Amino acid sequence: QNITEEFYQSTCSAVSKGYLGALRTGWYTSVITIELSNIKENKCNGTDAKVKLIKQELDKYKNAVTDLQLLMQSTPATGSGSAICSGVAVCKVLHLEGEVNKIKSALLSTNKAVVSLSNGVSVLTSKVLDLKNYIDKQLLPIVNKQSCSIPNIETVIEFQQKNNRLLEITREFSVNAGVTTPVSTYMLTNSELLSLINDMPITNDQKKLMSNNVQIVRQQSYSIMCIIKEEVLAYVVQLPLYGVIDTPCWKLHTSPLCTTNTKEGSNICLTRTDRGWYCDNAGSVSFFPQAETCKVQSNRVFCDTMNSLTLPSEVNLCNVDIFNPKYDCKIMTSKTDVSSSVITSLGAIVSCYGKTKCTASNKNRGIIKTFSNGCDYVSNKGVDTVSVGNTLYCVNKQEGQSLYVKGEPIINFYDPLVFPSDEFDASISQVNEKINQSLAFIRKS
Amino acid sequence: QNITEEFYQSTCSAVSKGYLGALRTGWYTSVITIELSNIKENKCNGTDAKVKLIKQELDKYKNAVTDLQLLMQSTPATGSGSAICSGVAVCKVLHLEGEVNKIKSALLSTNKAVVSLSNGVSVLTSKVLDLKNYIDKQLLPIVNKQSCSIPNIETVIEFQQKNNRLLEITREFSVNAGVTTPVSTYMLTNSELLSLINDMPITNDQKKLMSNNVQIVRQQSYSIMCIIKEEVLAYVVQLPLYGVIDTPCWKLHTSPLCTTNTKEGSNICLTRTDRGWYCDNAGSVSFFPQAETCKVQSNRVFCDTMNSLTLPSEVNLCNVDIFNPKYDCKIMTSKTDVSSSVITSLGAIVSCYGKTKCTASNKNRGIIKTFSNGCDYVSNKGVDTVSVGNTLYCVNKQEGQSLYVKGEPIINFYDPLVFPSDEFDASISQVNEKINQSLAFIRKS
Amino acid sequence: QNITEEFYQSTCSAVSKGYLGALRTGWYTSVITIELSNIKENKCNGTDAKVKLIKQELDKYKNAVTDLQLLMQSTPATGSGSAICSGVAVCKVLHLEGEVNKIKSALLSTNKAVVSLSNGVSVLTSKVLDLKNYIDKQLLPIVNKQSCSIPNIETVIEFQQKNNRLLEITREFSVNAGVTTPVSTYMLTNSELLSLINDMPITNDQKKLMSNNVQIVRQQSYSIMCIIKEEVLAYVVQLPLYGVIDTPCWKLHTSPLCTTNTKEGSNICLTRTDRGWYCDNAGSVSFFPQAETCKVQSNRVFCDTMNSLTLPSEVNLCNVDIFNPKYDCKIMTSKTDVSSSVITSLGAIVSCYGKTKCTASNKNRGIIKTFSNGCDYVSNKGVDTVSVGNTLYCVNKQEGQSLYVKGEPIINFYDPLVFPSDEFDASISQVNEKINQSLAFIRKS
Ligand SMILES: *[C@@H]1O[C@H](CO)[C@@H](O)[C@H](O)[C@H]1NC(C)=O
Ligand SMILES: *[C@@H]1O[C@H](CO)[C@@H](O)[C@H](O)[C@H]1NC(C)=O
Ligand SMILES: *[C@@H]1O[C@H](CO)[C@@H](O)[C@H](O)[C@H]1NC(C)=O
Numbered sequence A, B, C: 001q002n003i004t005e006e007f008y009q010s011t012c013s014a015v016s017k018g019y020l021g022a023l024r025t026g027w028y029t030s031v032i033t034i035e036l037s038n039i040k041e042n043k044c045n046g047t048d049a050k051v052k053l054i055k056q057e058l059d060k061y062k063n064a065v066t067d068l069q070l071l072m073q074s075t076p077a078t079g080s081g082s083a084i085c086s087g088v089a090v091c092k093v094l095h096l097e098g099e100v101n102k103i104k105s106a107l108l109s110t111n112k113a114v115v116s117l118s119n120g121v122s123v124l125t126s127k128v129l130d131l132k133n134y135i136d137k138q139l140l141p142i143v144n145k146q147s148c149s150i151p152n153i154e155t156v157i158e159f160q161q162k163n164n165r166l167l168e169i170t171r172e173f174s175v176n177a178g179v180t181t182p183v184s185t186y187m188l189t190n191s192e193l194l195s196l197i198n199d200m201p202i203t204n205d206q207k208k209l210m211s212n213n214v215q216i217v218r219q220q221s222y223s224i225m226c227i228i229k230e231e232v233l234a235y236v237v238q239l240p241l242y243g244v245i246d247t248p249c250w251k252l253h254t255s256p257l258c259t260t261n262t263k264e265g266s267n268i269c270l271t272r273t274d275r276g277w278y279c280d281n282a283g284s285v286s287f288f289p290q291a292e293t294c295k296v297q298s299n300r301v302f303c304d305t306m307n308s309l310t311l312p313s314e315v316n317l318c319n320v321d322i323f324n325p326k327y328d329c330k331i332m333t334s335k336t337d338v339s340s341s342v343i344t345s346l347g348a349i350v351s352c353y354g355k356t357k358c359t360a361s362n363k364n365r366g367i368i369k370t371f372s373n374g375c376d377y378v379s380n381k382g383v384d385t386v387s388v389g390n391t392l393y394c395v396n397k398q399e400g401q402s403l404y405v406k407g408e409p410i411i412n413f414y415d416p417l418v419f420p421s422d423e424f425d426a427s428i429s430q431v432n433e434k435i436n437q438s439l440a441f442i443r444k445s
Helices: A049-073 A085-094 A099-106 A131-143 A153-175 A190-198 A204-212 A214-219 A313-318 A428-443 B049-073 B085-094 B099-106 B131-143 B153-175 B190-198 B204-212 B214-219 B313-318 B428-443 C049-073 C085-094 C099-106 C131-143 C153-175 C190-198 C204-212 C214-219 C313-318 C428-443
Strands: A004-008 A013-024 A026-035 A112-116 A122-130 A222-228 A232-241 A244-254 A269-272 A276-281 A284-288 A294-297 A300-304 A309-311 A330-334 A340-343 A347-352 A358-362 A366-370 A374-379 A385-388 A391-394 A401-405 B004-008 B013-024 B026-035 B112-116 B122-130 B222-228 B232-241 B244-254 B269-272 B276-281 B284-288 B294-297 B300-304 B309-311 B330-334 B340-343 B347-352 B358-362 B366-370 B374-379 B385-388 B391-394 B401-405 C004-008 C013-024 C026-035 C112-116 C122-130 C222-228 C232-241 C244-254 C269-272 C276-281 C284-288 C294-297 C300-304 C309-311 C330-334 C340-343 C347-352 C358-362 C366-370 C374-379 C385-388 C391-394 C401-405
Touching (some): A013 A347, A026 A085, A026 A099, A026 A131, A049 A222, A049 C153, A049 C190, A085 A099, A099 A112, A099 A232, A122 A131, A122 A153, A122 A190, A131 A153, A153 B049, A153 B153, A153 C214, A190 A232, A214 A294, A214 B153, A244 A269, A276 A300, A276 A313, A330 A428, A340 A391, B013 B347, B026 B131, B049 B131, B085 B222, B099 B112, B122 B131, B122 B153, B122 B190, B131 B153, B153 C049, B153 C153, B190 B214, B190 B232, B190 C049, B204 B214, B204 B244, B214 B294, B214 C153, B284 B313, B340 B385, B347 B385, C013 C276, C013 C347, C026 C085, C026 C131, C049 C222, C085 C222, C099 C112, C122 C153, C122 C190, C131 C153, C153 C232, C190 C214, C190 C232, C244 C269, C284 C313, C340 C385, C347 C358
Parallel strands (some): A013 A300, B026 B122, C004 C401, C013 C300
Antiparallel strands (some): A004 A013, A013 A244, A244 A276, A276 A284, A340 A347, A347 A374, A358 A385, A385 A391, B004 B013, B244 B276, B276 B284, B347 B374, B358 B385, C004 C013, C013 C244, C026 C232, C112 C122, C244 C276, C294 C300, C340 C347, C347 C374, C358 C366, C358 C385
């Protein structure tokens, strides 16, 4: 809906609210088959140029098959094993006798079909390429006589086009040990992906979500290689199921908060930690510390709970009262006052320290705001760029309302002499405990 | 010019000087257009193989267009938004009525043309592919009658070649949400890029710089997707403008500096921080902490100020006097004495501790130097490899002069009992303050 | 052989044993040549469509050559220079007069041949593509008369197929500054790679190792561009030599170990550091801290000593007695008790703290184990998934024996009041020294 922001002058942090999250909680697996032709090499008296072209492209087909075979003889472990049991379980059933034969029978007359496998799983199977019909109908009469028949030039071109997708799939499955992500258009065309979404047990509102964000769905999908057996190449595509929909989400931005004394060696700094994406999830908050685990489109966020930490909902109270006893808000300390800026969703935090020249400009008016020393913020309303030293950042021109929440910077409530200035993973109450221990050591002395 | 190095035995660090830097300070945007053909699907009585091949490749063209359309209906946010306002501003003008019509008129007779847009911007527009002329002249008489005309086999091949670039551009813009970097040869051929450089408002010496380093220019460029409207596919290429040229640059190398006592638990360590690239920039120093933000060719360095910190020029004094009061030189402390090596531009720093077997060899002479415990350095003059434990590093055979600056290791000026051994972001004066506080706690006790 | 595991309840860590390692200790270089045709552009009266197609593909060949030339005029430095001297040394010899002429003579009649170069190096050279013979025999009579001869349509297609590999090689060498890794099938086909392995000075058991793990070999190989000179395009492929074979290897898994008091602010935490792969190597242990430097297939591990640290073999004693004086086992401390899990090779460590809902389920039985607060472990025998908060991890279904080594968690031997709770790189004896210093400051007070 309406994206809003709140800059907290006291902690040098901003919160971008109003995003609707879609969290991955399940997987929907589907079998993608390619019917191949078991045609060991055949040699006939051949010289005409069309026959040579056919045997060359046919040799590229034979090698793609032996290569997928050496990929499946020994399958190297991947860093994705913790996210693919759903699909590996389908591949293990397919290796059973008769299971590849069932899908070969269901897709005998149609391209798409639901097939009830062993393990009681009603999976949706599909056949995106048919090389067995093409090689056996158009090519075998051409290489399985005493002397080769002459194929027309249209067949030579059509076979290079059809065989291409097999080769590109073989290239991707080979360089990535059978597990590819994102799922490319070679693994699944956009036309095949949307029809696959349409044939899923999800709400009509959920099909609209995935169909309008196909690139994000591709980036949160996996393609797993199964088996080459009985003239069938099968591989599993693991598509995301978003069990959490339209959940409130926000993004925390933090920047160093130092004191602005003029004598070096007398300044202390604090920075809030755990910046990133937060989403309400099942009575708790799902936090995403890595930056690439959440894709954003407009007001919408797509996260994977695979790379999240589960925190109590009281973690949001670091945003309204950082000194609040229900949650131990985390900070880091240092004496490292280098100027920097963070481009938020609707503005910019600027931490200006020392002699750094910090400013905010409009493209036609020029410099419209000069930051003094400390931590400050400017909205995107009327601002295009922000300069810190020799670096120019661009402000997001997204529509929304910014709110500047005035307050005394909390770094000023701390005595420099007893401050712990090198904590790398501390907490507000931890630092206070270090101050009580440094104050007991001076009373005693 | 002449690359030189200075190893500082006192701080276990080396500085590689003599590089000439080219820092990105601006962007030069250009519009790249592809004229497409609005030919909704047309069906005629067709069976001949050439007609089938044409309709298949034509179907691949129709899907590439609907896919670029679903990419532009909802454009996902990227981590590059802080670096692309220059190009997003051109796309927003193109969405105005009449603006795509202007560039369609300027490139009616020629491929390249400067076009004055709204917003007073004289951008250089180009038309690298013409599918509207080819489909409407060679293909439409073939599918827009009662029965399809038979196209010759040369047309079938020429259309698969021309249509290919559209498909590869669609693949890259789709998997990357409309923003690609580096800019591939599909987005812009080397022939098109060099002619685009030649037609820029830069010095003759600056065109020679970018033309001789096209791969680095590609790696520091962005390709942004604009709009598909009125049979025109437009996308913006953002090329770097190096406002800083031939500026002095240097690279700092640091390695842990420990004491070499024989009893474990009695050794302390120090390591200089902020290793990376430094360049003189507008009265200050631009520091690049990330390693991949600066590309090196010979004596030349290409950095992006987007990922830099602006530091006072006194930061260079950590290299000549680390105990110097004008700048608080930063260090890290530990008791972690593991042997390691750093390959510098003209030699190697070796931090040898414990029982580790450290050496420097020549390919035909063998081991020519055995390092004892502590931090040392060897030039590339006569040295090919350096071995630390079970690891063999290769020495850069670049020509230059190395200078070994002798001095007492500063770790020896510190008493172990009161040393702070676990600081992760400290400073020379900070550590001295921790020593004064630990010395007041023992006087008191 | 048999993969086994040991979970140590006292330190919240697990060790996966039984892997056989293959460590890279050497390089085997090979020259890959492509004979090109020096045919500056030639123009004849041309209009027929086959001639146009030939000149278009020929123009793509001419540009691929000028592009490889601008790549070799100025070669940008790469982060791989410390691992490629073996191949750069072959390129420097090839630039000598007569050296490219020798390999051009040895591969005049055959595709593969061993060639003794200057520098006494008996390298294996190969010629994977012949464009000089094809252009000069099939194309030059077509563009080097007064008017162009008409080539048959088979030649037009065969030239687009042959020229393709040159263009794909030019694309990869251009975007990566002459050094590519992994080595793609365009640089070296699987058929060419296996024949290259077969012709190497290695044991019959070592050829079987590399031939059965070609994708891992590709990922641990480099392709380096040499020179374009006298109608010859040469580039060096650096293949790994595994000097260490069948060496014992193990993987250490660590998870935070906190106390489980009910009052926040009274809990302390410890986590073992240096998680990753360890292999016995030449009387010491080769440790691999980065996760991507070791590829695993079944019981087998493939590491590169380029990114390893050499540690004494006593480092294994942190696994049986962490309080052991022969090695100072490393830990990190905090007060950061967030629940998490680590999927091991044969089970899962679960660090459950606070109100987090931690469990282990079987697909058909449901929740079979509920973890209480502290650090615990569950084997893969009967367990499919493990849930921590809102995150579901998948358990590896690999066969092996797990051993739960019971013991009191060592975090309970520490008094909270004097514990150092913010160390980021500490050691067991270091922390004890901080406790002795905090105990002297309270006796004194
Ligand atoms: C520090 O001492 C004050 C004084 O009584 C007390 O109120 C506060 O709770 C103490 N802080 C901690 C973190 O124990
Ligand atoms: C530590 O004490 C000495 C003794 O007077 C003083 O000279 C020095 O400046 C002090 N160091 C710091 C960092 O305050
Ligand atoms: C701390 O003091 C005890 C008491 O004598 C001693 O045994 C121990 O070795 C000391 N620890 C360190 C790390 O010096």
